[PDB]
Structure 1
Amino acid sequence: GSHYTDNRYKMMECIKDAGRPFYPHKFKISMSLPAYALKYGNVENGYIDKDTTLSLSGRVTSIRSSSSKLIFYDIFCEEQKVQIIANIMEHDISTGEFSVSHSEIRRGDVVGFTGFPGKSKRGELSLFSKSVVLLSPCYHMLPTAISGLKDQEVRYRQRYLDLMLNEESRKVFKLRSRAIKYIRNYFDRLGFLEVETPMLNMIYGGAAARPFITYHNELETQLYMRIAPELYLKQLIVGGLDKVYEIGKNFRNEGIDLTHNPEFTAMEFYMAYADYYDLMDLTEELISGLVLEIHGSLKIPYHPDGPEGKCIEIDFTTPWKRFSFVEEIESGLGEKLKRPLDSQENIDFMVEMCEKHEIELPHPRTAAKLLDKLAGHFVETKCTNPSFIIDHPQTMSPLAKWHREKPEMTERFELFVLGKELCNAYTELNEPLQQRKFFEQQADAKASGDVEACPIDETFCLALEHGLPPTGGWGLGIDRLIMFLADKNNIKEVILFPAMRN
């Protein structure tokens, strides 16, 4: 273990001292391994073309031998395995003696070979090698599969090992790219403009989350990492850009678990002249279309407890179920919330109800946080298939425009799948007087110890004073999306280098 590594360092020193090949700068492949398979994969068993010499390269996944004169390698690159048959009778002695040449090679090494193409008598796609070059040695003994790792968390702390050994991990990251391409194309075809707004913020806002804090030394100013881009993106609608979207990181200085990483990838879009009804229709079309693209059906498997456990079929057939936020809580409770929803009376009542149904109390006990606890217990748990929870109270929705019909409510929805939040969207609040009021209430909750409440943002209020058109806005958690698309129950599966404890 420890000894293998030291020996390998010693081998490489020896190789260098001996003037043998030591980390060559450039190896010129004749073609990729996939291209090789495509060209030679259909030749007859035992076919060899001694009139073509080719150079191939990959990582060694196997070493076997029949004699001191015949060695069999597998190399892997770009999802393709090719066998190398090294017969001493073909060995170019100018590269060294056969046994010396091959004694420098171990499983896990990145290597190059030259030789003649064809297929073994047994029908294996092969190169009949004349030489081998060590390009980049592996200094550690590898397992042949992830099951051989000391523990499965090595897959995340040393992701290169997972990628090396585990086709399923590679497929996830390819599916993620494909899904994001689909999403961009959806909006590009609607005439959206992709934008980038600051990740360093003088004032954080646009979500309910605790921020990361930092400091710009030259400008002598505290900054926050953005929890969301919303407050910048809306300024672009004031600016008249009409349809904008942004895809990138949010930073939330919070705990980690199966559906939470301190940095995650979100998409937000803002569309002038849309309301939240329009946004519900768009969400259905975008997401059902992506599901159909990936899976070939709107009904897809999900394994909450891993692949040998129970399977639920998630059905994305549109239109999706709607749950009215307050009404469904009241159905669950068998009684009504007190009005107004943010009165001390309703706070007291919601505390009683949390205690009665054994729901963990939030801190502080704001109306907003209590409502969220009750929603989490009574409503989110009904959202197995994609379901919209709609019409959130204003008290928990400071950037959402008041509901045109329903007192105390807003024109907001969240999309939930398997009980987890995927999207958050609303008819945007564009009336500066109440916006300012709602910011002041947020700053009061923050001063009372609500670490998820944001400070007042005057620059945003001033922007609203220049006239935000009627607008609909929307956010999607891309990591969580990939979790459902790829049937993973742990966000660490869909992020290359996720946060880990010590």
Structure 2
Amino acid sequence: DPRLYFENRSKFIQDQKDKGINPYPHKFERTISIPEFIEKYKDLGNGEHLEDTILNITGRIMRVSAQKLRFFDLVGDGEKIQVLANYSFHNHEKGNFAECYDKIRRGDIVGIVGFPGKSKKGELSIFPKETILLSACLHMLPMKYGLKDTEIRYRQRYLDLLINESSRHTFVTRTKIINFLRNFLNERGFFEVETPMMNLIANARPFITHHNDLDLDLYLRIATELPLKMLIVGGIDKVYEIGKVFRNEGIDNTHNPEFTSCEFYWAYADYNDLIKWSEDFFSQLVYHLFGTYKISYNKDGPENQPIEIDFTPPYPKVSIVEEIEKVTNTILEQPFDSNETIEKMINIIKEHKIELPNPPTAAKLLDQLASHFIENKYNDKPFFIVEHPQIMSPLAKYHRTKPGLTERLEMFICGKEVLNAYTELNDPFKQKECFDSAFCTSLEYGLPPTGGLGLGIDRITMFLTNKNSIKDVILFPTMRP
């Protein structure tokens, strides 16, 4: 019984207390980490002991086996050495050999005083002259299988990190990705800021909460767009923010209501500048992690074959309106709001037995046509969908040569959006929504020509760590109790 094992250990904790031994001592003076231990002593010869060097080392006992030789696994920082407790090397003054090492269970945190060496079998080991209990583990830890089907991976992420080596590697990579992005932006002149997480006016339903001092209801931000643009007016010409945004909608495998975004604004940047930034960032980010531009991705899970994703630039550019016509052998033109055009779009959706969006707005229909007919055109390499109609992007600047369109771009990997960008509409007389109030007033003080860009960091982490669910890249995903 896990229940009964917990009570035995808890009684042991009192038992130790009433023998005068504190099972939770204050401080152990460590000399060296486990990863530093492995590097420093990996190339010794087999069976060799460095008996003069005395080290203080800590770690988590992860495996216990045995009659006067005791073997443990000691793990720290995702790496592992062996503990070889020899009765001959023990300091019999500190207590009975057997009594000390019989109390120890898998999962215990211990401090060890000892010397480094390799086994006769060549396993690099610490040879304890003394071993102190530093913090007991009171439950039975599980082994790997316990954490494959269940969702305690998500409710008890600390157990996952201890048991599954890959989980650590996933979450190191996530941190490496964000470091690379921050460094990539800082090296190019960009300036990182923080804008508010609550605002008075907030596409998506907001999180709402009551602010007790102002006696007002506030909204968690759904993006960082408006405050960053104001900083462009203010003269910070390259500005960005990495932080959480919130959309109070349904969960699925690539949608978490709270997620991590990077948005930047680049004054005097145009469409080519933005395309170039996107190809440089992804191609260099992949190479930095993997030493190659090609990665394998299990688009349909580990039970199915992976596809290969090639991040070698340049990436294809697919114009959305033109492409929908070609694959559908249709012609969609004029006001796309034209009921005529709408009907062509609506009849395409029913002929191919697709869901009709409610309401059947021209922007919603075009999006639906793109997810079915364009968004899975390539899967072997990322690509852009470009030049969306103005009705789908009311904040975007008009395309320079094609009427009705914008210079917008969207990057896709395996049919999922990861990057969104366009040049900004800066003539206040043509921004329809200026019939948020602060942004319109700021526009009248002069916004230079500007490009904005946003990245979805969780999804980017999913592809580069071969995950299909967003919960596998968020440390503590929010679940019902």
Q: TM-score, normalised by structure 2?
A: 0.95
Corresponding residue number in structure 2 for 1:103: 102
Structure 2: unaligned runs, 5 residues or longer: none
Corresponding residue number in structure 2 for 1:200: 198
List aligned pairs for 1:11-160, cutoff 5 A.
Answer: 11-65=12-66, 67=67, 69-145=68-144, 147-149=145-147, 151-160=149-158
Corresponding residue number in structure 1 for 2:411: 415
List aligned pairs for 1:252-271, cutoff 5 A.
Answer: 252-271=247-266
Of 223, 226, 229, the match for 2:221: 226
Structure 1: unaligned runs, 5 residues or longer: 441-456
d(CA) in 2 for partners of 1:9 and 1:364? 61
Which residue identity lines up with residue 65 of structure 2 in the other structure? R
d(CA) in 2 for partners of 1:282 and 1:55? 49
List aligned pairs for 1:333-352, cutoff 5 A.
Answer: 333-352=328-347
Corresponding residue number in structure 2 for 1:170: 168
Deviation at 1:389, TM superposition (A): 0.4
Deviation at 1:493, TM superposition (A): 1.8
Which residue identity lines up with residue 441 of structure 2 in the other structure? L
SS of 2:171 mapped into structure 1: helix
Deviation at 1:53, TM superposition (A): 2.2
Conservation of the 8 A alpha-carbon contact between 1:338 and 1:349: no
Percent identical pairs in the alignment equals 56
Which residue identity lines up with residue 192 of structure 2 in the other structure? E
Residue 241 (structure 1) aligned with residue 233 (structure 2): no
d(CA) in 1 for partners of 2:445 and 2:315? 37
Of 313, 317, 323, the match for 1:318: 313
CA distances 1:436-493 after superposition (whole Å, capped 9, x unpaired): x2466xxxxxxxxxxxxxxxx2111111111110001100111111112222222222
d(CA) in 1 for partners of 2:314 and 2:257? 33
Which residue identity lines up with residue 324 of structure 1 in the other structure? S
Which residue identity lines up with residue 36 of structure 1 in the other structure? F
Corresponding residue number in structure 2 for 1:497: 476
Conservation of the 8 A alpha-carbon contact between 1:95 and 1:101: no
Which residue identity lines up with residue 418 of structure 1 in the other structure? C
Which residue identity lines up with residue 483 of structure 1 in the other structure? M
SS of 1:369 mapped into structure 2: helix
SS of 1:288 mapped into structure 2: helix
Which residue identity lines up with residue 168 of structure 2 in the other structure? R
Residue 426 (structure 1) aligned with residue 422 (structure 2): yes
Of 400, 403, 411, the match for 2:396: 400
Deviation at 1:96, TM superposition (A): 2.7
CA distances 1:52-83 after superposition (whole Å, capped 9, x unpaired): 32221111111111x1x221111000132111
Corresponding residue number in structure 1 for 2:325: 330
CA distances 1:204-261 after superposition (whole Å, capped 9, x unpaired): 2xxx322211121110111111110011111011111111111111111111111111
SS of 1:86 mapped into structure 2: strand
Change (3 A) 1:102 1:298: same
Deviation at 1:164, TM superposition (A): 0.5
Deviation at 1:114, TM superposition (A): 1.3
How large is the RMSD of aligned CA atoms in angstroms? 1.7
Corresponding residue number in structure 1 for 2:3: 2
Conservation of the 8 A alpha-carbon contact between 2:111 and 2:134: yes
CA distances 1:287-343 after superposition (whole Å, capped 9, x unpaired): 111112122222221111233521211122222111111111122322122531123
SS of 2:438 mapped into structure 1: helix
d(CA) in 2 for partners of 1:356 and 1:393? 23
Conservation of the 8 A alpha-carbon contact between 2:107 and 2:136: yes
d(CA) in 2 for partners of 1:372 and 1:9? 59
Of 446, 453, 456, the match for 1:474: 453
Q: TM-score, normalised by structure 1?
A: 0.92
